Amino acid sequence: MIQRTPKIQVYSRHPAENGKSNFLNCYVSGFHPSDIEVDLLKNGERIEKVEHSDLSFSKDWSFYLLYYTEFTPTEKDEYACRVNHVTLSQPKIVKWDRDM
């Protein structure tokens, strides 16, 4: 069947400043089928309070979802998004870079 691997962007809702509450987003898009595992990580560990948007899709029928959680960015804490999908041999981890 049709299998499309997810695109991933990891980013903050607002320009990141250390010490100021923000939202960490992982936007997964372009994938099919819709079953997907997405976790937000803080220093490698799964963040427990993570919400996601209602599943929708694009003109080519590929799906997209936003996963998000409140976070307070700091200088030393590392954040990332971990995605697994039928198209991926192993989970893909994308690190948050405040410049992108």
Q: Which residues in this chain contact other proteins in the complex, by CB under 8 A? A: 1-2, 4, 7, 9, 11, 13, 15, 23, 25, 27, 29, 32-35, 53-57, 61-63, 66, 68, 99-100
User: Considering beta carbons, is residue 44 or 92 the nearer one to other proteins?
Assistant: 92
Q: What sign does the CA torsion over 82, 85, 90, 94 have? A: negative
Look at the block and give the residue holding tokens 């320009």.
Answer: 15
- Closest approach of other proteins to the CB of residue 38, in Å: 14
Nearer to other proteins, 7 or 44 (CB): 7
Following CA atoms 13, 15, 16, 21 in sequence, which dihedral angle do they give, to the nearest 10 degrees? -50
- To other proteins, the closest distance from the beta carbon of 87 in angstroms equals 12
**Residues linked to residue 42 through DSSP beta bridges, in sequence order:** 45, 79
Nearest residue (CB) to other proteins, 13 versus 46: 13
When the beta carbons of 44 and 60 are compared against other proteins, the nearer one is 60
| CB 31, min distance to other proteins, A | 10
Distance between CA 65 and CA 39 in Å, rounded?
12
* H or E, element range at 12: strand 7-12
